[PDB]
Amino acid sequence: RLILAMDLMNRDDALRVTGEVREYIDTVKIGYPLVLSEGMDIIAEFRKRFGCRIIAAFAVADIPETNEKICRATFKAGADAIIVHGFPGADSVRACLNVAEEMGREVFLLTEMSHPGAEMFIQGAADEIARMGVDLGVKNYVGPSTRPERLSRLREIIGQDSFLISPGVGAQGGDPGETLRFADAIIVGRSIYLADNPAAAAAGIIESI
Amino acid sequence: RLILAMDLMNRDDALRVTGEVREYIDTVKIGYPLVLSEGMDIIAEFRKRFGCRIIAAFAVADIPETNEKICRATFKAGADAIIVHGFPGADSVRACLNVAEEMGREVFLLTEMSHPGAEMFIQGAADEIARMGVDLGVKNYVGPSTRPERLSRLREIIGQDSFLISPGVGAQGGDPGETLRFADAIIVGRSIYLADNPAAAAAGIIESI
Ligand SMILES: O=C(O)c1cc(=O)[nH]c(=O)n1[C@@H]1O[C@H](COP(=O)(O)O)[C@@H](O)[C@H]1O
Ligand SMILES: O=C(O)c1cc(=O)[nH]c(=O)n1[C@@H]1O[C@H](COP(=O)(O)O)[C@@H](O)[C@H]1O
């Protein structure tokens, strides 16, 4: 129930840490910090070297036509799933869902974000964003570890059969156990990759739950 | 280093056995016996329910244009890789490789087959089929558990960095340990899925190696 957020920017460090904690995870979330520094080929390299599923954390948030292009390039690169913002609206989300269907991949809908600024505009639209996801047939969602009461409400909207993952554990203040009361899996980045012993940090999280 | 060949024909039995042996495998090989009986949607169902990588054992062996169509449909259905015959020639293999590249997926090249009949025509062409794979950039291969001396020769041609999987273990007479002297992983079907206790059978194989 642990997903590693691999946001280190250099290939050597990213490969080292991911290899050290492989036994504690099954999925690696790779985003722009690593991809823009080392190239999209890093996705296929990780998939091959570690045999883990890869979620591309690209917070897709453009118009439908551009979202389609981003999703196509991302799935061509080997990602198993992509994270898409719901705030830009249904047409933008549908464009991503259409490419995922064409390529046999998945879309994760980012509802409410975990950082403080999410309270300004996203939080007020999050319940409706989750409902839009349900209406569009979305089965995978992202919600905040930092606000378990919001994570509970989002779980209420999407149902027990939807898959919900949650970032904000550790560095941002979220608790593994409390988050897993509602999410199926937790995303952890810095608490593991900036640790003196990433494997010990991962093991500690797994033990705490 | 164990791949389950799930050749049961009904969804209920296939799901039961795969769930029972999940802890001993990481990849499920699904072929036409199950897909033609239950539909291509079974691939996505397995991927979701078990979180395993799926190799579509479709022994692709048609002209380039048709191979492209088969690969596209197979990857759209969610398969992570597809098994392609090398005997029909380089253009037929290249067509599959092109679709795999477009979709961020992989091709496994079937060189020499494991059954007795493979000695009639395939065996005599197998070394050249493997060399053709190397020339085309193929990195994943299938070779016979039933003939470890042939598996050794094929490993010699493709190199240590290529990934080699091998069927024919158990029912067809192949030995897990001897096969793993050359292959990276073994494929096992009947010895596990027809057993009175599939999990015990899988565990026994893992223990024997
Ligand atoms: O889209 C995301 O992955 C994301 C959404 C969100 O609301 N909050 C959030 O933290 N993330 C990401 O999840 C990861 C969390 O990393 P840490 O705070 O280091 O554990 C980072 O890659 C973030 O960019
Ligand atoms: O393409 C294959 O997967 C295949 C190639 C080959 O040379 N030999 C071979 O047995 N297979 C398949 O691998 C599986 C082996 O199953 P069992 O003999 O029951 O363990 C079946 O799905 C076969 O169709």
Side-chain angles (χ1 to χ4, degrees):
Chain A
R1 298 180 76 178
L2 181 61
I3 297 169
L4 171 68
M6 180 36 65
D7 297 314
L8 286 171
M9 284 155 93
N10 71 72
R11 177 171 164 282
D12 294 322
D13 298 332
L15 291 173
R16 180 191 82 240
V17 175
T18 304
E20 288 176 348
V21 308
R22 177 60 183 72
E23 74 192 81
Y24 307 104
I25 72 176
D26 70 305
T27 307
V28 181
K29 183 175 86 68
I30 294 179
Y32 287 134
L34 180 56
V35 162
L36 297 185
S37 298
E38 298 289 357
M40 287 290 274
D41 286 353
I42 198 76
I43 289 171
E45 180 170 28
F46 265 60
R47 209 152 170 297
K48 175 180 180 179
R49 184 155 168 171
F50 308 116
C52 295
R53 285 287 179 201
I54 300 296
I55 297 173
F58 291 175
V60 183
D62 217 294
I63 67 170
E65 290 84 350
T66 296
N67 280 9
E68 174 181 353
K69 296 173 177 72
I70 292 168
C71 290
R72 203 178 301 288
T74 301
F75 296 141
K76 171 174 182 178
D80 295 284
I82 191 171
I83 294 178
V84 177
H85 264 293
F87 203 76
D91 54 354
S92 285
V93 176
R94 283 207 198 70
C96 299
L97 290 171
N98 290 340
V99 179
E101 180 173 5
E102 176 179 350
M103 301 182 80
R105 307 289 196 171
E106 307 182 77
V107 166
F108 274 73
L109 185 67
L110 175 54
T111 63
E112 179 168 337
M113 284 179 81
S114 64
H115 66 299
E119 297 184 337
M120 196 182 304
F121 307 110
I122 292 170
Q123 184 175 81
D127 283 2
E128 180 167 5
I129 286 171
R131 264 272 152 49
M132 169 186 71
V134 174
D135 292 335
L136 294 174
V138 175
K139 299 300 184 57
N140 303 288
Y141 299 79
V142 189
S145 171
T146 52
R147 304 186 194 98
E149 84 283 22
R150 293 297 299 138
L151 201 57
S152 176
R153 171 57 174 156
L154 294 163
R155 165 61 73 188
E156 189 178 312
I157 293 163
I158 69 180
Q160 303 300 315
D161 302 318
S162 290
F163 186 63
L164 173 61
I165 67 180
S166 182
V169 176
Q172 295 178 57
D175 182 72
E178 286 296 292
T179 302
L180 291 169
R181 290 174 58 203
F182 311 104
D184 296 287
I186 50 171
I187 289 160
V188 179
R190 287 167 286 170
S191 287
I192 290 170
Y193 73 69
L194 295 182
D196 281 341
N197 187 329
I205 287 165
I206 294 184
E207 157 281 313
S208 74
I209 66 177
Chain B
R1 298 180 76 178
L2 181 61
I3 297 169
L4 171 68
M6 180 36 65
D7 297 314
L8 286 171
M9 284 155 93
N10 71 72
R11 177 171 164 282
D12 294 322
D13 298 332
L15 291 173
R16 180 191 82 240
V17 175
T18 304
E20 288 176 348
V21 308
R22 177 60 183 72
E23 74 192 81
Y24 307 104
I25 72 176
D26 70 305
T27 307
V28 181
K29 183 175 86 68
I30 294 179
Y32 287 134
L34 180 56
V35 162
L36 297 185
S37 298
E38 298 289 357
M40 287 290 274
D41 286 353
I42 198 76
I43 289 171
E45 180 170 28
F46 265 60
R47 209 152 170 297
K48 175 180 180 179
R49 184 155 168 171
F50 308 116
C52 295
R53 285 287 179 201
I54 300 296
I55 297 173
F58 291 175
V60 183
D62 217 294
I63 67 170
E65 290 84 350
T66 296
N67 280 9
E68 174 181 353
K69 296 173 177 72
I70 292 168
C71 290
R72 203 178 301 288
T74 301
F75 296 141
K76 171 174 182 178
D80 295 284
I82 191 171
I83 294 178
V84 177
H85 264 293
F87 203 76
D91 54 354
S92 285
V93 176
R94 283 207 198 70
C96 299
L97 290 171
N98 290 340
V99 179
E101 180 173 5
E102 176 179 350
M103 301 182 80
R105 307 289 196 171
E106 307 182 77
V107 166
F108 274 73
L109 185 67
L110 175 54
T111 63
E112 179 168 337
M113 284 179 81
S114 64
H115 66 299
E119 297 184 337
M120 196 182 304
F121 307 110
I122 292 170
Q123 184 175 81
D127 283 2
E128 180 167 5
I129 286 171
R131 264 272 152 49
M132 169 186 71
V134 174
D135 292 335
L136 294 174
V138 175
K139 299 300 184 57
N140 303 288
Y141 299 79
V142 189
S145 171
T146 52
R147 304 186 194 98
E149 84 283 22
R150 293 297 299 138
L151 201 57
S152 176
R153 171 57 174 156
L154 294 163
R155 165 61 73 188
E156 189 178 312
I157 293 163
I158 69 180
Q160 303 300 315
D161 302 318
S162 290
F163 186 63
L164 173 61
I165 67 180
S166 182
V169 176
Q172 295 178 57
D175 182 72
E178 286 296 292
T179 302
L180 291 169
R181 290 174 58 203
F182 311 104
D184 296 287
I186 50 171
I187 289 160
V188 179
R190 287 167 286 170
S191 287
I192 290 170
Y193 73 69
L194 295 182
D196 281 341
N197 187 329
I205 287 165
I206 294 184
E207 157 281 313
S208 74
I209 66 177

